[PDB]
Structures are given as C-alpha cells and as structure tokens.
Amino acid sequence: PPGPPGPPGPKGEPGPPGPPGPPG
Amino acid sequence: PPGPPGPPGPKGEPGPPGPPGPPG
Amino acid sequence: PPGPPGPPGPKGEPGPPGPPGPPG
C-alpha cells in the first residue's frame, strides 16, 4: 500500500494591504 | 514513505483600514 | 509507494494596515 499522506503545506502568504483610511 | 508536503495555503485577509487622514 | 501529497497549508496572516486617509 502507498504510504501516509504528506504533511500540510506551508502557510499561505500574508494578505494584501488594507484600504485607505477615512477622510481626515 | 510519507507523501510530499501539500500546497501552500491561501492568502490571508486584507489588512485593517488605514488611519484617518492627518489633522488639519 | 510514496504516499500522496498532503493537504493545503493554513491560511496566511492578515495583511498590513492600509494607507492614511485623505486630508479633510
């Protein structure tokens, strides 16, 4: 029989920068 | 033997909204 | 035989804060 499934992959990338803040 | 590590995970959430615009 | 690929890795971190908003 085939061996065990591999480990979880690496963690994904950080998400994008947030959007602009509110008008001053 | 165990299989290979899986694919990288998905990207994270967009970051928090930015700060308010500057005073004045 | 080698096991198959593992599952997808964890979801990434939130991104950095967005830019300061417009001047008022």
mmCIF file with all atom_site columns, all heavy atoms in Angstrom, chain A residues 1-4 6-19 21 24, chain C residues 1-4 6-10 12-19 21-22 24:
data_model
loop_
_atom_site.group_PDB
_atom_site.id
_atom_site.type_symbol
_atom_site.label_atom_id
_atom_site.label_alt_id
_atom_site.label_comp_id
_atom_site.label_asym_id
_atom_site.label_entity_id
_atom_site.label_seq_id
_atom_site.pdbx_PDB_ins_code
_atom_site.Cartn_x
_atom_site.Cartn_y
_atom_site.Cartn_z
_atom_site.occupancy
_atom_site.B_iso_or_equiv
_atom_site.pdbx_formal_charge
_atom_site.auth_seq_id
_atom_site.auth_comp_id
_atom_site.auth_asym_id
_atom_site.auth_atom_id
_atom_site.pdbx_PDB_model_num
ATOM 1   N N   . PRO A 1 1  ? 0.803   -1.224 0.000  1.00 0.00 ? 1  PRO A N   1
ATOM 2   C CA  . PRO A 1 1  ? 0.000   0.000  0.000  1.00 0.00 ? 1  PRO A CA  1
ATOM 3   C C   . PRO A 1 1  ? 0.833   1.271  0.000  1.00 0.00 ? 1  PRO A C   1
ATOM 4   O O   . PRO A 1 1  ? 1.924   1.313  0.527  1.00 0.00 ? 1  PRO A O   1
ATOM 5   C CB  . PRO A 1 1  ? -0.863  -0.128 1.260  1.00 0.00 ? 1  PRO A CB  1
ATOM 6   C CG  . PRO A 1 1  ? -0.043  -0.997 2.188  1.00 0.00 ? 1  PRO A CG  1
ATOM 7   C CD  . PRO A 1 1  ? 0.755   -1.933 1.290  1.00 0.00 ? 1  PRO A CD  1
ATOM 8   N N   . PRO A 1 2  ? 0.312   2.311  -0.633 1.00 0.00 ? 2  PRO A N   1
ATOM 9   C CA  . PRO A 1 2  ? 1.002   3.611  -0.624 1.00 0.00 ? 2  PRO A CA  1
ATOM 10  C C   . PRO A 1 2  ? 1.139   4.067  0.817  1.00 0.00 ? 2  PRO A C   1
ATOM 11  O O   . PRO A 1 2  ? 0.361   3.709  1.672  1.00 0.00 ? 2  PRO A O   1
ATOM 12  C CB  . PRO A 1 2  ? 0.193   4.588  -1.491 1.00 0.00 ? 2  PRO A CB  1
ATOM 13  C CG  . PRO A 1 2  ? -0.613  3.661  -2.385 1.00 0.00 ? 2  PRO A CG  1
ATOM 14  C CD  . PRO A 1 2  ? -0.914  2.478  -1.478 1.00 0.00 ? 2  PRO A CD  1
ATOM 15  N N   . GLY A 1 3  ? 2.161   4.882  1.058  1.00 0.00 ? 3  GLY A N   1
ATOM 16  C CA  . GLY A 1 3  ? 2.427   5.422  2.380  1.00 0.00 ? 3  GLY A CA  1
ATOM 17  C C   . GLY A 1 3  ? 1.418   6.467  2.813  1.00 0.00 ? 3  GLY A C   1
ATOM 18  O O   . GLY A 1 3  ? 0.469   6.769  2.089  1.00 0.00 ? 3  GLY A O   1
ATOM 19  N N   . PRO A 1 4  ? 1.613   7.023  4.014  1.00 0.00 ? 4  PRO A N   1
ATOM 20  C CA  . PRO A 1 4  ? 0.720   8.057  4.543  1.00 0.00 ? 4  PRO A CA  1
ATOM 21  C C   . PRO A 1 4  ? 0.725   9.323  3.696  1.00 0.00 ? 4  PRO A C   1
ATOM 22  O O   . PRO A 1 4  ? 1.740   9.638  3.070  1.00 0.00 ? 4  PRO A O   1
ATOM 23  C CB  . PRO A 1 4  ? 1.298   8.347  5.931  1.00 0.00 ? 4  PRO A CB  1
ATOM 24  C CG  . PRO A 1 4  ? 2.074   7.128  6.294  1.00 0.00 ? 4  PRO A CG  1
ATOM 25  C CD  . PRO A 1 4  ? 2.644   6.635  4.988  1.00 0.00 ? 4  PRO A CD  1
ATOM 26  N N   . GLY A 1 6  ? 1.126   13.178 2.838  1.00 0.00 ? 6  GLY A N   1
ATOM 27  C CA  . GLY A 1 6  ? 2.152   14.095 3.278  1.00 0.00 ? 6  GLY A CA  1
ATOM 28  C C   . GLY A 1 6  ? 1.626   15.080 4.298  1.00 0.00 ? 6  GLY A C   1
ATOM 29  O O   . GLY A 1 6  ? 0.422   15.138 4.556  1.00 0.00 ? 6  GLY A O   1
ATOM 30  N N   . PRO A 1 7  ? 2.532   15.867 4.889  1.00 0.00 ? 7  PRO A N   1
ATOM 31  C CA  . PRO A 1 7  ? 2.123   16.921 5.817  1.00 0.00 ? 7  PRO A CA  1
ATOM 32  C C   . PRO A 1 7  ? 1.308   18.022 5.139  1.00 0.00 ? 7  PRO A C   1
ATOM 33  O O   . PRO A 1 7  ? 1.330   18.160 3.927  1.00 0.00 ? 7  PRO A O   1
ATOM 34  C CB  . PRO A 1 7  ? 3.459   17.483 6.322  1.00 0.00 ? 7  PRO A CB  1
ATOM 35  C CG  . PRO A 1 7  ? 4.467   16.437 6.046  1.00 0.00 ? 7  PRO A CG  1
ATOM 36  C CD  . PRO A 1 7  ? 3.998   15.728 4.816  1.00 0.00 ? 7  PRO A CD  1
ATOM 37  N N   . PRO A 1 8  ? 0.588   18.795 5.933  1.00 0.00 ? 8  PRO A N   1
ATOM 38  C CA  . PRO A 1 8  ? 0.016   20.066 5.461  1.00 0.00 ? 8  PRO A CA  1
ATOM 39  C C   . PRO A 1 8  ? 1.097   20.871 4.760  1.00 0.00 ? 8  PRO A C   1
ATOM 40  O O   . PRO A 1 8  ? 2.263   20.833 5.109  1.00 0.00 ? 8  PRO A O   1
ATOM 41  C CB  . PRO A 1 8  ? -0.554  20.791 6.688  1.00 0.00 ? 8  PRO A CB  1
ATOM 42  C CG  . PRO A 1 8  ? -0.782  19.653 7.670  1.00 0.00 ? 8  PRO A CG  1
ATOM 43  C CD  . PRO A 1 8  ? 0.393   18.726 7.403  1.00 0.00 ? 8  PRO A CD  1
ATOM 44  N N   . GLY A 1 9  ? 0.680   21.623 3.751  1.00 0.00 ? 9  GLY A N   1
ATOM 45  C CA  . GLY A 1 9  ? 1.589   22.512 3.056  1.00 0.00 ? 9  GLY A CA  1
ATOM 46  C C   . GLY A 1 9  ? 2.030   23.689 3.914  1.00 0.00 ? 9  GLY A C   1
ATOM 47  O O   . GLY A 1 9  ? 1.547   23.879 5.039  1.00 0.00 ? 9  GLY A O   1
ATOM 48  N N   . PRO A 1 10 ? 2.959   24.489 3.397  1.00 0.00 ? 10 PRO A N   1
ATOM 49  C CA  . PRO A 1 10 ? 3.350   25.708 4.111  1.00 0.00 ? 10 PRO A CA  1
ATOM 50  C C   . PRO A 1 10 ? 2.176   26.661 4.279  1.00 0.00 ? 10 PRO A C   1
ATOM 51  O O   . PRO A 1 10 ? 1.188   26.618 3.543  1.00 0.00 ? 10 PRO A O   1
ATOM 52  C CB  . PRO A 1 10 ? 4.435   26.320 3.214  1.00 0.00 ? 10 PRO A CB  1
ATOM 53  C CG  . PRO A 1 10 ? 4.917   25.216 2.369  1.00 0.00 ? 10 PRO A CG  1
ATOM 54  C CD  . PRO A 1 10 ? 3.762   24.286 2.179  1.00 0.00 ? 10 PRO A CD  1
ATOM 55  N N   . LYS A 1 11 ? 2.294   27.529 5.279  1.00 0.00 ? 11 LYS A N   1
ATOM 56  C CA  . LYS A 1 11 ? 1.301   28.574 5.470  1.00 0.00 ? 11 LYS A CA  1
ATOM 57  C C   . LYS A 1 11 ? 1.265   29.487 4.253  1.00 0.00 ? 11 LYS A C   1
ATOM 58  O O   . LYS A 1 11 ? 2.278   29.710 3.580  1.00 0.00 ? 11 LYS A O   1
ATOM 59  C CB  . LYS A 1 11 ? 1.615   29.389 6.725  1.00 0.00 ? 11 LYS A CB  1
ATOM 60  C CG  . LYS A 1 11 ? 1.590   28.594 8.012  1.00 0.00 ? 11 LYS A CG  1
ATOM 61  C CD  . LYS A 1 11 ? 1.709   29.520 9.212  1.00 0.00 ? 11 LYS A CD  1
ATOM 62  C CE  . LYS A 1 11 ? 2.179   28.779 10.448 1.00 0.00 ? 11 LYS A CE  1
ATOM 63  N NZ  . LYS A 1 11 ? 1.279   27.662 10.826 1.00 0.00 ? 11 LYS A NZ  1
ATOM 64  N N   . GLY A 1 12 ? 0.082   30.013 3.966  1.00 0.00 ? 12 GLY A N   1
ATOM 65  C CA  . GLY A 1 12 ? -0.083  30.914 2.845  1.00 0.00 ? 12 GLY A CA  1
ATOM 66  C C   . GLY A 1 12 ? 0.508   32.293 3.101  1.00 0.00 ? 12 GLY A C   1
ATOM 67  O O   . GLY A 1 12 ? 0.934   32.635 4.204  1.00 0.00 ? 12 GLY A O   1
ATOM 68  N N   . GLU A 1 13 ? 0.511   33.108 2.047  1.00 0.00 ? 13 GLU A N   1
ATOM 69  C CA  . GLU A 1 13 ? 1.114   34.436 2.123  1.00 0.00 ? 13 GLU A CA  1
ATOM 70  C C   . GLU A 1 13 ? 0.240   35.388 2.940  1.00 0.00 ? 13 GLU A C   1
ATOM 71  O O   . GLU A 1 13 ? -0.981  35.223 3.038  1.00 0.00 ? 13 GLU A O   1
ATOM 72  C CB  . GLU A 1 13 ? 1.355   35.021 0.726  1.00 0.00 ? 13 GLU A CB  1
ATOM 73  C CG  . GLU A 1 13 ? 0.100   35.314 -0.090 1.00 0.00 ? 13 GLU A CG  1
ATOM 74  C CD  . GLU A 1 13 ? 0.389   36.003 -1.426 1.00 0.00 ? 13 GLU A CD  1
ATOM 75  O OE1 . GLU A 1 13 ? 1.562   36.020 -1.868 1.00 0.00 ? 13 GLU A OE1 1
ATOM 76  O OE2 . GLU A 1 13 ? -0.569  36.517 -2.046 1.00 0.00 ? 13 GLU A OE2 1
ATOM 77  N N   . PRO A 1 14 ? 0.883   36.384 3.531  1.00 0.00 ? 14 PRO A N   1
ATOM 78  C CA  . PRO A 1 14 ? 0.154   37.487 4.180  1.00 0.00 ? 14 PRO A CA  1
ATOM 79  C C   . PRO A 1 14 ? -0.836  38.055 3.176  1.00 0.00 ? 14 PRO A C   1
ATOM 80  O O   . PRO A 1 14 ? -0.607  38.061 1.982  1.00 0.00 ? 14 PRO A O   1
ATOM 81  C CB  . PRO A 1 14 ? 1.192   38.517 4.651  1.00 0.00 ? 14 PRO A CB  1
ATOM 82  C CG  . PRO A 1 14 ? 2.465   37.694 4.748  1.00 0.00 ? 14 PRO A CG  1
ATOM 83  C CD  . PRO A 1 14 ? 2.334   36.713 3.593  1.00 0.00 ? 14 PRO A CD  1
ATOM 84  N N   . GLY A 1 15 ? -1.961  38.549 3.679  1.00 0.00 ? 15 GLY A N   1
ATOM 85  C CA  . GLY A 1 15 ? -2.950  39.142 2.802  1.00 0.00 ? 15 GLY A CA  1
ATOM 86  C C   . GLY A 1 15 ? -2.492  40.495 2.288  1.00 0.00 ? 15 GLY A C   1
ATOM 87  O O   . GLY A 1 15 ? -1.426  40.990 2.677  1.00 0.00 ? 15 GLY A O   1
ATOM 88  N N   . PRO A 1 16 ? -3.293  41.096 1.398  1.00 0.00 ? 16 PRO A N   1
ATOM 89  C CA  . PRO A 1 16 ? -2.975  42.428 0.878  1.00 0.00 ? 16 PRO A CA  1
ATOM 90  C C   . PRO A 1 16 ? -3.036  43.516 1.936  1.00 0.00 ? 16 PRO A C   1
ATOM 91  O O   . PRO A 1 16 ? -3.659  43.346 2.976  1.00 0.00 ? 16 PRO A O   1
ATOM 92  C CB  . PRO A 1 16 ? -4.056  42.666 -0.181 1.00 0.00 ? 16 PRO A CB  1
ATOM 93  C CG  . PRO A 1 16 ? -4.590  41.312 -0.518 1.00 0.00 ? 16 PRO A CG  1
ATOM 94  C CD  . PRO A 1 16 ? -4.455  40.493 0.718  1.00 0.00 ? 16 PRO A CD  1
ATOM 95  N N   . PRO A 1 17 ? -2.392  44.637 1.657  1.00 0.00 ? 17 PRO A N   1
ATOM 96  C CA  . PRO A 1 17 ? -2.573  45.849 2.471  1.00 0.00 ? 17 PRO A CA  1
ATOM 97  C C   . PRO A 1 17 ? -4.051  46.188 2.557  1.00 0.00 ? 17 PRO A C   1
ATOM 98  O O   . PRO A 1 17 ? -4.803  46.003 1.620  1.00 0.00 ? 17 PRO A O   1
ATOM 99  C CB  . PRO A 1 17 ? -1.761  46.974 1.814  1.00 0.00 ? 17 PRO A CB  1
ATOM 100 C CG  . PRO A 1 17 ? -0.763  46.220 0.950  1.00 0.00 ? 17 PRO A CG  1
ATOM 101 C CD  . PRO A 1 17 ? -1.539  44.988 0.511  1.00 0.00 ? 17 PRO A CD  1
ATOM 102 N N   . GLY A 1 18 ? -4.454  46.707 3.712  1.00 0.00 ? 18 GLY A N   1
ATOM 103 C CA  . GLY A 1 18 ? -5.787  47.256 3.873  1.00 0.00 ? 18 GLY A CA  1
ATOM 104 C C   . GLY A 1 18 ? -6.041  48.441 2.953  1.00 0.00 ? 18 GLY A C   1
ATOM 105 O O   . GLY A 1 18 ? -5.115  48.987 2.345  1.00 0.00 ? 18 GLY A O   1
ATOM 106 N N   . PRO A 1 19 ? -7.311  48.845 2.840  1.00 0.00 ? 19 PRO A N   1
ATOM 107 C CA  . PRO A 1 19 ? -7.708  50.002 2.035  1.00 0.00 ? 19 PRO A CA  1
ATOM 108 C C   . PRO A 1 19 ? -7.432  51.304 2.758  1.00 0.00 ? 19 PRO A C   1
ATOM 109 O O   . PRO A 1 19 ? -7.078  51.294 3.930  1.00 0.00 ? 19 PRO A O   1
ATOM 110 C CB  . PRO A 1 19 ? -9.203  49.788 1.852  1.00 0.00 ? 19 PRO A CB  1
ATOM 111 C CG  . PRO A 1 19 ? -9.613  49.175 3.166  1.00 0.00 ? 19 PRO A CG  1
ATOM 112 C CD  . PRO A 1 19 ? -8.467  48.256 3.541  1.00 0.00 ? 19 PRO A CD  1
ATOM 113 N N   . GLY A 1 21 ? -7.708  54.713 4.826  1.00 0.00 ? 21 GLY A N   1
ATOM 114 C CA  . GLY A 1 21 ? -8.481  55.113 5.978  1.00 0.00 ? 21 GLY A CA  1
ATOM 115 C C   . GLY A 1 21 ? -9.494  56.186 5.634  1.00 0.00 ? 21 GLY A C   1
ATOM 116 O O   . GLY A 1 21 ? -9.539  56.695 4.501  1.00 0.00 ? 21 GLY A O   1
ATOM 117 N N   . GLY A 1 24 ? -9.759  62.683 6.772  1.00 0.00 ? 24 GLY A N   1
ATOM 118 C CA  . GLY A 1 24 ? -9.322  63.339 7.999  1.00 0.00 ? 24 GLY A CA  1
ATOM 119 C C   . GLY A 1 24 ? -10.443 64.319 8.404  1.00 0.00 ? 24 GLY A C   1
ATOM 120 O O   . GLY A 1 24 ? -11.088 64.931 7.546  1.00 0.00 ? 24 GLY A O   1
ATOM 121 N N   . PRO C 1 1  ? 4.825   2.293  -2.249 1.00 0.00 ? 1  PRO C N   1
ATOM 122 C CA  . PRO C 1 1  ? 4.864   3.564  -2.976 1.00 0.00 ? 1  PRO C CA  1
ATOM 123 C C   . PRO C 1 1  ? 4.758   4.756  -2.041 1.00 0.00 ? 1  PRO C C   1
ATOM 124 O O   . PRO C 1 1  ? 4.151   4.652  -0.997 1.00 0.00 ? 1  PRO C O   1
ATOM 125 C CB  . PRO C 1 1  ? 3.666   3.488  -3.935 1.00 0.00 ? 1  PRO C CB  1
ATOM 126 C CG  . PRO C 1 1  ? 3.202   2.034  -3.892 1.00 0.00 ? 1  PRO C CG  1
ATOM 127 C CD  . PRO C 1 1  ? 3.599   1.533  -2.532 1.00 0.00 ? 1  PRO C CD  1
ATOM 128 N N   . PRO C 1 2  ? 5.342   5.886  -2.419 1.00 0.00 ? 2  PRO C N   1
ATOM 129 C CA  . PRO C 1 2  ? 5.205   7.099  -1.597 1.00 0.00 ? 2  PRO C CA  1
ATOM 130 C C   . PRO C 1 2  ? 3.732   7.452  -1.464 1.00 0.00 ? 2  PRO C C   1
ATOM 131 O O   . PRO C 1 2  ? 2.935   7.249  -2.364 1.00 0.00 ? 2  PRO C O   1
ATOM 132 C CB  . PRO C 1 2  ? 6.033   8.206  -2.272 1.00 0.00 ? 2  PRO C CB  1
ATOM 133 C CG  . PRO C 1 2  ? 7.112   7.423  -3.003 1.00 0.00 ? 2  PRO C CG  1
ATOM 134 C CD  . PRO C 1 2  ? 6.372   6.187  -3.491 1.00 0.00 ? 2  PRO C CD  1
ATOM 135 N N   . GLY C 1 3  ? 3.369   7.984  -0.302 1.00 0.00 ? 3  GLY C N   1
ATOM 136 C CA  . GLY C 1 3  ? 2.027   8.491  -0.112 1.00 0.00 ? 3  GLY C CA  1
ATOM 137 C C   . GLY C 1 3  ? 1.770   9.675  -1.027 1.00 0.00 ? 3  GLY C C   1
ATOM 138 O O   . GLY C 1 3  ? 2.703   10.228 -1.614 1.00 0.00 ? 3  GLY C O   1
ATOM 139 N N   . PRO C 1 4  ? 0.499   10.075 -1.159 1.00 0.00 ? 4  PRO C N   1
ATOM 140 C CA  . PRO C 1 4  ? 0.147   11.237 -1.974 1.00 0.00 ? 4  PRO C CA  1
ATOM 141 C C   . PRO C 1 4  ? 0.423   12.555 -1.252 1.00 0.00 ? 4  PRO C C   1
ATOM 142 O O   . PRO C 1 4  ? 0.707   12.562 -0.056 1.00 0.00 ? 4  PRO C O   1
ATOM 143 C CB  . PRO C 1 4  ? -1.350  11.055 -2.197 1.00 0.00 ? 4  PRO C CB  1
ATOM 144 C CG  . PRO C 1 4  ? -1.808  10.434 -0.919 1.00 0.00 ? 4  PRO C CG  1
ATOM 145 C CD  . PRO C 1 4  ? -0.685  9.513  -0.482 1.00 0.00 ? 4  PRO C CD  1
ATOM 146 N N   . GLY C 1 6  ? 0.145   15.972 0.758  1.00 0.00 ? 6  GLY C N   1
ATOM 147 C CA  . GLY C 1 6  ? -0.643  16.393 1.897  1.00 0.00 ? 6  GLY C CA  1
ATOM 148 C C   . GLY C 1 6  ? -1.671  17.438 1.529  1.00 0.00 ? 6  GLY C C   1
ATOM 149 O O   . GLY C 1 6  ? -1.743  17.889 0.375  1.00 0.00 ? 6  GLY C O   1
ATOM 150 N N   . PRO C 1 7  ? -2.480  17.844 2.510  1.00 0.00 ? 7  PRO C N   1
ATOM 151 C CA  . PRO C 1 7  ? -3.489  18.866 2.254  1.00 0.00 ? 7  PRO C CA  1
ATOM 152 C C   . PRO C 1 7  ? -2.884  20.265 2.184  1.00 0.00 ? 7  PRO C C   1
ATOM 153 O O   . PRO C 1 7  ? -1.714  20.473 2.502  1.00 0.00 ? 7  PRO C O   1
ATOM 154 C CB  . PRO C 1 7  ? -4.423  18.731 3.450  1.00 0.00 ? 7  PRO C CB  1
ATOM 155 C CG  . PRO C 1 7  ? -3.521  18.283 4.556  1.00 0.00 ? 7  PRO C CG  1
ATOM 156 C CD  . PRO C 1 7  ? -2.502  17.384 3.911  1.00 0.00 ? 7  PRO C CD  1
ATOM 157 N N   . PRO C 1 8  ? -3.689  21.219 1.748  1.00 0.00 ? 8  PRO C N   1
ATOM 158 C CA  . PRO C 1 8  ? -3.246  22.619 1.674  1.00 0.00 ? 8  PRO C CA  1
ATOM 159 C C   . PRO C 1 8  ? -2.832  23.110 3.051  1.00 0.00 ? 8  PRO C C   1
ATOM 160 O O   . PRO C 1 8  ? -3.398  22.745 4.066  1.00 0.00 ? 8  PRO C O   1
ATOM 161 C CB  . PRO C 1 8  ? -4.407  23.423 1.071  1.00 0.00 ? 8  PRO C CB  1
ATOM 162 C CG  . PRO C 1 8  ? -5.218  22.356 0.357  1.00 0.00 ? 8  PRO C CG  1
ATOM 163 C CD  . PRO C 1 8  ? -5.087  21.155 1.279  1.00 0.00 ? 8  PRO C CD  1
ATOM 164 N N   . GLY C 1 9  ? -1.819  23.970 3.060  1.00 0.00 ? 9  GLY C N   1
ATOM 165 C CA  . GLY C 1 9  ? -1.343  24.577 4.285  1.00 0.00 ? 9  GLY C CA  1
ATOM 166 C C   . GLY C 1 9  ? -2.341  25.575 4.851  1.00 0.00 ? 9  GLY C C   1
ATOM 167 O O   . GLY C 1 9  ? -3.339  25.904 4.207  1.00 0.00 ? 9  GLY C O   1
ATOM 168 N N   . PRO C 1 10 ? -2.082  26.057 6.062  1.00 0.00 ? 10 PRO C N   1
ATOM 169 C CA  . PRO C 1 10 ? -3.005  27.010 6.683  1.00 0.00 ? 10 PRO C CA  1
ATOM 170 C C   . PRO C 1 10 ? -3.091  28.323 5.921  1.00 0.00 ? 10 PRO C C   1
ATOM 171 O O   . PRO C 1 10 ? -2.163  28.738 5.226  1.00 0.00 ? 10 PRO C O   1
ATOM 172 C CB  . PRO C 1 10 ? -2.408  27.230 8.076  1.00 0.00 ? 10 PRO C CB  1
ATOM 173 C CG  . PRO C 1 10 ? -1.488  26.097 8.307  1.00 0.00 ? 10 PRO C CG  1
ATOM 174 C CD  . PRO C 1 10 ? -1.006  25.639 6.976  1.00 0.00 ? 10 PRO C CD  1
ATOM 175 N N   . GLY C 1 12 ? -2.966  32.234 5.299  1.00 0.00 ? 12 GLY C N   1
ATOM 176 C CA  . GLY C 1 12 ? -1.981  33.216 5.717  1.00 0.00 ? 12 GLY C CA  1
ATOM 177 C C   . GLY C 1 12 ? -2.528  34.256 6.686  1.00 0.00 ? 12 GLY C C   1
ATOM 178 O O   . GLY C 1 12 ? -3.724  34.332 6.981  1.00 0.00 ? 12 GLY C O   1
ATOM 179 N N   . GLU C 1 13 ? -1.599  35.064 7.200  1.00 0.00 ? 13 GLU C N   1
ATOM 180 C CA  . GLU C 1 13 ? -1.900  36.156 8.124  1.00 0.00 ? 13 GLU C CA  1
ATOM 181 C C   . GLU C 1 13 ? -2.597  37.292 7.421  1.00 0.00 ? 13 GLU C C   1
ATOM 182 O O   . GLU C 1 13 ? -2.481  37.437 6.210  1.00 0.00 ? 13 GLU C O   1
ATOM 183 C CB  . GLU C 1 13 ? -0.620  36.712 8.757  1.00 0.00 ? 13 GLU C CB  1
ATOM 184 C CG  . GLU C 1 13 ? 0.218   35.722 9.506  1.00 0.00 ? 13 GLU C CG  1
ATOM 185 C CD  . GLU C 1 13 ? 1.386   36.394 10.205 1.00 0.00 ? 13 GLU C CD  1
ATOM 186 O OE1 . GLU C 1 13 ? 1.541   37.632 10.056 1.00 0.00 ? 13 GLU C OE1 1
ATOM 187 O OE2 . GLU C 1 13 ? 2.142   35.690 10.904 1.00 0.00 ? 13 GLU C OE2 1
ATOM 188 N N   . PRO C 1 14 ? -3.281  38.131 8.188  1.00 0.00 ? 14 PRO C N   1
ATOM 189 C CA  . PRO C 1 14 ? -3.826  39.381 7.635  1.00 0.00 ? 14 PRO C CA  1
ATOM 190 C C   . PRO C 1 14 ? -2.675  40.233 7.124  1.00 0.00 ? 14 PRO C C   1
ATOM 191 O O   . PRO C 1 14 ? -1.563  40.194 7.624  1.00 0.00 ? 14 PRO C O   1
ATOM 192 C CB  . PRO C 1 14 ? -4.644  40.058 8.748  1.00 0.00 ? 14 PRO C CB  1
ATOM 193 C CG  . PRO C 1 14 ? -4.958  38.903 9.687  1.00 0.00 ? 14 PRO C CG  1
ATOM 194 C CD  . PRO C 1 14 ? -3.696  38.056 9.616  1.00 0.00 ? 14 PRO C CD  1
ATOM 195 N N   . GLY C 1 15 ? -2.970  41.025 6.100  1.00 0.00 ? 15 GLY C N   1
ATOM 196 C CA  . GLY C 1 15 ? -2.001  41.964 5.579  1.00 0.00 ? 15 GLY C CA  1
ATOM 197 C C   . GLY C 1 15 ? -1.784  43.172 6.465  1.00 0.00 ? 15 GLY C C   1
ATOM 198 O O   . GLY C 1 15 ? -2.416  43.325 7.517  1.00 0.00 ? 15 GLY C O   1
ATOM 199 N N   . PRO C 1 16 ? -0.876  44.054 6.043  1.00 0.00 ? 16 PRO C N   1
ATOM 200 C CA  . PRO C 1 16 ? -0.590  45.241 6.846  1.00 0.00 ? 16 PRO C CA  1
ATOM 201 C C   . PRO C 1 16 ? -1.704  46.272 6.724  1.00 0.00 ? 16 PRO C C   1
ATOM 202 O O   . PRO C 1 16 ? -2.512  46.197 5.801  1.00 0.00 ? 16 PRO C O   1
ATOM 203 C CB  . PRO C 1 16 ? 0.733   45.751 6.262  1.00 0.00 ? 16 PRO C CB  1
ATOM 204 C CG  . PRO C 1 16 ? 0.768   45.228 4.865  1.00 0.00 ? 16 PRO C CG  1
ATOM 205 C CD  . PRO C 1 16 ? -0.006  43.938 4.862  1.00 0.00 ? 16 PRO C CD  1
ATOM 206 N N   . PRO C 1 17 ? -1.756  47.214 7.658  1.00 0.00 ? 17 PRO C N   1
ATOM 207 C CA  . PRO C 1 17 ? -2.735  48.311 7.604  1.00 0.00 ? 17 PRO C CA  1
ATOM 208 C C   . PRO C 1 17 ? -2.664  49.083 6.298  1.00 0.00 ? 17 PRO C C   1
ATOM 209 O O   . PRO C 1 17 ? -1.630  49.228 5.666  1.00 0.00 ? 17 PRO C O   1
ATOM 210 C CB  . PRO C 1 17 ? -2.465  49.216 8.821  1.00 0.00 ? 17 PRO C CB  1
ATOM 211 C CG  . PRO C 1 17 ? -1.708  48.288 9.755  1.00 0.00 ? 17 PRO C CG  1
ATOM 212 C CD  . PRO C 1 17 ? -0.838  47.486 8.802  1.00 0.00 ? 17 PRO C CD  1
ATOM 213 N N   . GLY C 1 18 ? -3.816  49.622 5.924  1.00 0.00 ? 18 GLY C N   1
ATOM 214 C CA  . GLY C 1 18 ? -3.911  50.454 4.746  1.00 0.00 ? 18 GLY C CA  1
ATOM 215 C C   . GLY C 1 18 ? -3.291  51.822 4.957  1.00 0.00 ? 18 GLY C C   1
ATOM 216 O O   . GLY C 1 18 ? -2.855  52.153 6.071  1.00 0.00 ? 18 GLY C O   1
ATOM 217 N N   . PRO C 1 19 ? -3.247  52.629 3.887  1.00 0.00 ? 19 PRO C N   1
ATOM 218 C CA  . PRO C 1 19 ? -2.680  53.977 3.961  1.00 0.00 ? 19 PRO C CA  1
ATOM 219 C C   . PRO C 1 19 ? -3.551  54.946 4.742  1.00 0.00 ? 19 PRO C C   1
ATOM 220 O O   . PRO C 1 19 ? -4.755  54.757 4.839  1.00 0.00 ? 19 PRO C O   1
ATOM 221 C CB  . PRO C 1 19 ? -2.605  54.420 2.496  1.00 0.00 ? 19 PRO C CB  1
ATOM 222 C CG  . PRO C 1 19 ? -2.850  53.212 1.678  1.00 0.00 ? 19 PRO C CG  1
ATOM 223 C CD  . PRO C 1 19 ? -3.671  52.289 2.519  1.00 0.00 ? 19 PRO C CD  1
ATOM 224 N N   . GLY C 1 21 ? -5.875  58.002 5.358  1.00 0.00 ? 21 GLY C N   1
ATOM 225 C CA  . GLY C 1 21 ? -6.920  58.534 4.501  1.00 0.00 ? 21 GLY C CA  1
ATOM 226 C C   . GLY C 1 21 ? -6.613  59.926 3.979  1.00 0.00 ? 21 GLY C C   1
ATOM 227 O O   . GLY C 1 21 ? -5.598  60.520 4.333  1.00 0.00 ? 21 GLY C O   1
ATOM 228 N N   . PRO C 1 22 ? -7.493  60.455 3.121  1.00 0.00 ? 22 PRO C N   1
ATOM 229 C CA  . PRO C 1 22 ? -7.295  61.797 2.577  1.00 0.00 ? 22 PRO C CA  1
ATOM 230 C C   . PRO C 1 22 ? -7.321  62.886 3.642  1.00 0.00 ? 22 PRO C C   1
ATOM 231 O O   . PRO C 1 22 ? -7.990  62.753 4.668  1.00 0.00 ? 22 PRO C O   1
ATOM 232 C CB  . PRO C 1 22 ? -8.476  61.968 1.621  1.00 0.00 ? 22 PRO C CB  1
ATOM 233 C CG  . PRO C 1 22 ? -8.942  60.600 1.316  1.00 0.00 ? 22 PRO C CG  1
ATOM 234 C CD  . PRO C 1 22 ? -8.685  59.808 2.555  1.00 0.00 ? 22 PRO C CD  1
ATOM 235 N N   . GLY C 1 24 ? -8.705  66.205 5.186  1.00 0.00 ? 24 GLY C N   1
ATOM 236 C CA  . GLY C 1 24 ? -10.084 66.686 5.247  1.00 0.00 ? 24 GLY C CA  1
ATOM 237 C C   . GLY C 1 24 ? -10.179 68.087 4.602  1.00 0.00 ? 24 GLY C C   1
ATOM 238 O O   . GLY C 1 24 ? -9.251  68.894 4.693  1.00 0.00 ? 24 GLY C O   1
#
